[PDB]
Amino acid sequence: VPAAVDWRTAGAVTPVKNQQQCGCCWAFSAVAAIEGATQIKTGTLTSLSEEQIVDCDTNGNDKGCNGGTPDGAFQYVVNNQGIDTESDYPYTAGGGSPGTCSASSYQPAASITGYQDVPANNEQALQQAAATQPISVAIDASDPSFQSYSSGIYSGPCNTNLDHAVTVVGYGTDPNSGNSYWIVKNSWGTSWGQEGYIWMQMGLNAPYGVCGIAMQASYPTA
């Protein structure tokens, strides 16, 4: 297992997006993971449609702006046999309202055959998975210290009352403190955090991880 990983400079991460006032973090996290798995397999990096999942994944446990899970999103893309581009099917649910499903109006750009769940409450297993591709994870993002994060290695304070899905795109170590961190792509636009990213310290709140990051992790099979 490598000591450092950064899928952004390796070419598997699209620019930061903004979910705005739609409770569909589940779909943003799933799409970032699908974009990463697709690029690693095919070599092409293309922004994919969160709106398709929010609008179309309505026959299972996922509920648009009312929440869902990254696994439910993966299952929908598996069942649909594809997902469209962001360019063709842009995000319009920012005001808190999805629309009618338009998946068949466009040419699908990517597909996946399944997904895998990372062993729960297990940062070693999460690190092994993150070294191979971006990973969808769940965290408790309710603390004011998280809401107002700007820079540095975030160590809390935060509980494990999971309420937000984000994407791990790598991990590193700060040379001066010597502390290691997860590199996490959030969906709150570039005005939040480090141009949309947060470094979340590794090795905390065992076995759950900082803010519960190692509790509920998964990734798609391209």
DSSP state of 23: B
Helix axes 25-42, 70-80, angle to 10 degrees: 50
Strand partners, 23: 66
Burial of 26 (0-12, 13-18, 19+ CB in 10 A): buried
Instruction: Extract the tokens encoding 16.
Output: 């930061």
Query: Sign (positive/negative) of CA torsion 189, 194, 197, 200?
Result: negative
Among the listed residues 25, 56, 158, 211, the single catalytic one is: 25
DSSP state of 65: T
101 is a catalytic site residue: no
158 is a catalytic site residue: no
Asked whether the beta carbons of 13 and 26 are under 8 A apart, the reply is no
25 is a catalytic site residue: yes
Among the listed residues 22, 186, 205, 211, the single catalytic one is: 186
Asked whether the beta carbons of 24 and 64 are under 8 A apart, the reply is yes
Task: Give the residue numbers annotated as catalytic, written as ranges.
Answer: 25, 164, 186
